[PDB]
């Protein structure tokens, strides 16, 4: 006899944002009370009967907490239902952001693993890794302390498309565990493969004199709707593919007016899946005189 | 006789009412033999017919791992389908998946199947050649382009030609005494008046396996297919099935009507008539 509690659009919410708690019980979204973990059996707001979902807006730090709901059950020894599943509202933006980096890198072969390392010069007690999206839950790790930084290694994988996307990480300090830092700079984690690798080539070719034009052509018999041109160490270009007479799919990346060059690979991708890339093309080295 | 194995997946979003939910069931012919439900506590593939229960722990661990993986896959495919059709994140949607194989009496593959649906309508299907797709709309054409670029048909084909037939042959052995023994229907005819000049004759077939059956009413040998009311074949709950067929007849003409029953468990078709 448990209600189902949920937060929308995200239980991880910036301060000043908005989150709605919904309590669904016996085919209804009404007539329920809320409780916080530290003070159970004492309803919040002096026992406010929520006749509708609870919209917290704008979100403040006082909204952060670990919630359960009980729905009105009129013929019962308490008059109320059992406690719902717990939902933890985490309010972000309350400390300087940590940093997030991928080892060995953010392009992850299908089936393989990647470490996402969160770290800060602030002594965070816990670190949270959150993948962008509606109704997405964070992973938590204790912060390890060494050499004046705290850090945590989040292991992601075996990589597949459900794990690809934009990640951010967060720190919390000892006595405000439901208050999170500002988010780290975002990191896009991309899965490469198993879509077949395209072909890379340059026009007129890979040897460019100063002041001459170089265009990089990514090509495939697969119908990629977009190609990503990726340079070793840089520069991340995207272009739509166009179908050619010989049935190849192709995008032409003009370089210049003074690109210095380097080794290039290209990847195909598809509409509405921006973090699923094909296998990398064979590399192509461009040298500007 | 011929035999078939099918797996059926249902993946459902239900925003604000539950977590995204993945349900899988496995069938040999008309007999359910396994299930997985991501809503249970500690989801796992579980036996649903006695003849699978003595598969070892290596079987269930491999099945449970596969189902957990597919639940994660199809939870995300629901989000993808939202973008393909430009639908709100507040509504409830359903993906359905079917695959499996048909084998002949020698146990060799006759054909493979793999079809997908979104919100109860065809979405994409593997063709009979097991190496190409037919897409039902422009959203599914995106999926087709992706599955072509990833050579997904080759993986379906390897399974349908290999493990699918191999396991179906094993399950048919495990449950031979129930899966390959046709139980004939027990039959009778009932009579009820609807007025002072018409009555209903109802031909009953009970306790039969497998579910395939033909019940017909004849009058002077002519098939009363248009005047016959046939109910959907229905499960008894004990792995047999039930069906009936009714016709409305002029009172006093009951002797003209015969019910005909065809079923794998009958060595010859049965003819029935009602008698006071």
């Amino acid at each position: 006899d448990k209600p189902f509690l949920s937060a929308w659009p995200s239980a991880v919410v910036p301060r000043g944002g908005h989150v709605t708690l919904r309590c669904h019980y016996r085919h209804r979204f009404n007539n329920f009370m809320l409780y916080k973990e530290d003070r159970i059996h004492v309803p919040i707001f002096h026992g406010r009967l929520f006749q509708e979902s609870f919209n917290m807006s704008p979100v403040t730090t006082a909204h952060a907490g670990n919630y359960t709901c009980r729905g009105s059950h009129p013929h019962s020894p308490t008059g109320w239902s059992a406690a719902s599943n717990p939902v933890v509202i985490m309010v972000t933006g309350n400390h300087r952001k940590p940093s997030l980096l991928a080892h060995p890198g953010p392009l992850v072969k299908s089936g393989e693993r990647v470490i996402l390392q969160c770290w800060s010069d602030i002594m965070f007690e816990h670190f949270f890794l959150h993948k962008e999206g509606i109704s997405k839950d964070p992973s938590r790790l204790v912060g390890q302390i060494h050499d004046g930084v705290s850090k945590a290694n989040f292991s992601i994988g075996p990589m597949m498309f459900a794990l690809a996307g934009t990640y951010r990480c967060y720190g919390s300090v000892t006595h405000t565990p439901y208050q999170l830092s500002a988010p780290s700079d975002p990191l896009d984690i991309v899965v490469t493969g198993p879509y077949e690798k395209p072909s890379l080539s340059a026009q007129p070719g890979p040897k460019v004199q100063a002041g001459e034009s170089v265009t990089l052509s990514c090509s495939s018999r697969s119908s990629y709707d977009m190609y990503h041109l990726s340079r070793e160490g840089g520069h991340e270009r995207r272009l739509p593919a166009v179908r050619k007479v010989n049935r190849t799919f192709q995008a032409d990346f003009p370089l210049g007016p003074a690109t210095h060059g380097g080794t290039y690979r290209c990847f195909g991708s598809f509409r509405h899946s921006p973090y699923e890339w094909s296998d990398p093309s064979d590399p192509l080295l461009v040298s500007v005189t | 006789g011929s035999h078939s194995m099918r797996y059926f997946y249902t993946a459902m979003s239900r925003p604000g009412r539950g977590e995204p939910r993945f349900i899988a069931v496995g069938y040999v012919d008309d007999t359910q033999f396994v299930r997985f439900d991501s809503d249970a506590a500690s989801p796992r593939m579980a036996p649903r017919a006695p003849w699978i229960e003595q598969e070892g722990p290596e079987y269930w661990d491999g099945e449970t791992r596969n189902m957990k993986a597919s639940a994660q896959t199809y939870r995300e495919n629901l989000r993808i389908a939202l973008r393909y059709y430009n639908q709100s994140e507040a509504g409830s949607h359903i993906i359905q998946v079917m695959y499996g194989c048909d084998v002949g009496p020698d146990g060799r593959l006759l054909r493979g199947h793999n079809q997908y649906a979104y919100d109860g309508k065809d979405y994409i299907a593997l063709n009979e050649d097991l190496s190409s797709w037919t897409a039902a709309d422009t959203a599914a054409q995106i999926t087709q382009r992706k599955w072509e670029a990833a050579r997904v048909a080759e993986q379906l084909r390897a399974y349908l030609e290999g493990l699918c037939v191999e396991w179906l042959r094993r399950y048919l052995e495990n449950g031979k005494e129930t899966l390959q023994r046709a139980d004939p229907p027990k039959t009778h005819v009932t009579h009820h008046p609807i007025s002072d000049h018409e009555a209903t004759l109802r031909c009953w077939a009970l306790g039969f396996y497998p579910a395939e059956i033909t019940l017909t009413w004849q009058r002077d040998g002519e098939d009363q297919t248009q005047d016959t009311e046939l109910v959907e074949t229905r499960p008894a709950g004990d792995r047999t099935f039930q069906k009936w067929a009714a016709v409305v007849v002029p009172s006093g003409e009951e002797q003209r009507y015969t019910c005909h029953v065809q079923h794998e468990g009958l060595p010859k078709p049965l003819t029935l008539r009602w008698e006071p």
Binding site: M160, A162 | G62, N66, A69, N77, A81
Partner: peptide, 10 residues
């Protein structure tokens, strides 16, 4: 036994 489909997306 069920089909094991590695990493396949719609």
């Amino acid at each position: 036994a069920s089909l094991n489909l590695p990493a396949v997306s719609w």
